[PDB]
Amino acid sequence: KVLPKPLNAPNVIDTGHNFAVINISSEPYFGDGPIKSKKLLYKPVNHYEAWQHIQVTNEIVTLNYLEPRTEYELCVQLVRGEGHPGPVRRFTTASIGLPPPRGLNLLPKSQTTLNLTWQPIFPSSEDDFYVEVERRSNIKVPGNLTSVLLNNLHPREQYMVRARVNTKAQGEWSEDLTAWTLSDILPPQPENIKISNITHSSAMISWTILDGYSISSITIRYKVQGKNEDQHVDVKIKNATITQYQLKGLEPETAYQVDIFAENNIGSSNPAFSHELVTLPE
């Protein structure tokens, strides 16, 4: 009595990202009936492990608890003991959405050009991928790239850009990245110049700058009041987010001339001078 063995490989009916629905194609078989038990054997390809299995009452079965984008192999055994496995079916599960690229940075390269960069990407699957970049009013860049040049923009403009990673699935959008093109003109001077916490040795100085002019740096020049002074002091603040400063080491009962500048890709601003800093006796 020849042990029965299916004619056709199992058929995949519906595939998800975590589940596969299979028609095991038990019948028709070759050999002698009747059949008292049908077994579907399944296993992720290139995984060194024993085959998993379940008994199938009928013809249709759903494999749950699967992994994304994984290829699985399927075959069926029938019992009249156990016979030879039928033809093998291979299928791959579905892609899930990828999170946006890491270390996203949008930076000015010119007055008409922004550069968007991200960290190199290592997916959990061998999907072919590209990055979709959206300027918020679309350009598709090959996934082997980590930088995209956004051209033909206008000087002194503010742009918002987001990205996502596309395979077959569509990716999760990044949060917007806001950046400015470089300025075409000199920056405006610092504003709201107040001086507080005067001592005999020190004083606090604060200001605000206007956004939109690519102000990358701030110079605070101070100097003892005289028509005859051989020395002045330039403090150079290369991070234009700092908006206050403690002046220390001054001379008591002394009048100072304080000037505050702001610079960008074009040049410096006019002096935002302050009405006199005069330290206290002692």
Pick from 166, 180, 158: nearest CA to 129: 166
Establish if 194 lies at the interface with its own copies (CB under 8 A). Answer: no
Q: Is 242 in the site for its own copies (CB under 8 A)?
A: no
Q: Which helix (H) or strand (E) holds 277?
A: strand 277-278
Considering the complex, what minimum distance in angstroms separates the CB of residue 158 from its own copies? Answer: 5
Task: State the residue for tokens 């399944």.
Answer: 42
Dihedral angle, C-alpha 180, 181, 186, 189, nearest 10 °: 0
Among 254, 270, 276, 278, binds its own copies (CB under 8 A): 270
Q: Residue 240: left (phi > 0), alpha (psi -120 to 50), or beta?
A: alpha
Q: How far apart are CA 64 and CA 51, in angstroms?
A: 15
- Rg of the Cα atoms in the chain: 35
Task: Quote the CA–CA distance of 129 and 12 in Å, as a whole number.
Answer: 25
Residue 40 or residue 161: which is nearer to its own copies going by CB? 161
For residue 191, which phi and psi values (nearest 5 degrees)?
A: -125, 170
Kindly indicate which of the ranges 7-15, 33-41, 209-217, 240-248 contains the residues binding its own copies, using the contact rule CB under 8 A: 209-217
Work out whether 37 is an interface residue with its own copies (CB under 8 A).
no
Minimum gap (Å) between residue 211 Cβ and its own copies: 6
Residue closer to its own copies, measured from CB, 185 or 278: 185
Please choose, out of 64-72, 112-120, 150-158, 165-173, the segment that lies near its own copies by the rule CB under 8 A: 150-158
Closest of 63, 62, 59, 58 to residue 44, by C-alpha: 63
When asked if residue 157 is in the footprint of its own copies (CB under 8 A), the reply is yes
200: tokens are 């005999």
Question: Applying CB under 8 A, does 186 fall inside the site for its own copies?
Answer: yes
Nearer to its own copies, 252 or 267 (CB): 267
Candidates 31, 85, 87, 188: give the one binding its own copies (CB under 8 A).
188
Which of 32, 175, 211, 234 lies at the binding interface for its own copies (CB under 8 A)? Answer: 211
Could you say whether residue 244 binds its own copies (CB under 8 A)?
A: no
Comparison of 82 and 191: residue with beta carbon closer to its own copies:
191
Query: Does 191 contact its own copies by CB under 8 A?
Result: yes
Report phi then psi at 175, rounded to 5: -70, 155
Q: Are 272 and 188 in contact (CB under 8 A)?
A: no
User: Contact between 135 and its own copies (CB under 8 A)?
Assistant: no
User: Which of 185, 235, 242, 255 is the binder for its own copies (CB under 8 A)?
Assistant: 185
10 vs 259 by CB, closer to its own copies: 259
Q: What angle do CA 141, 145, 147 make, to 5 degrees?
A: 85
Give yes or no for residue 172 binding its own copies (CB under 8 A). no
Applying CB under 8 A, which residues contact its own copies? 154, 156-158, 185-186, 188, 191, 210-212, 270
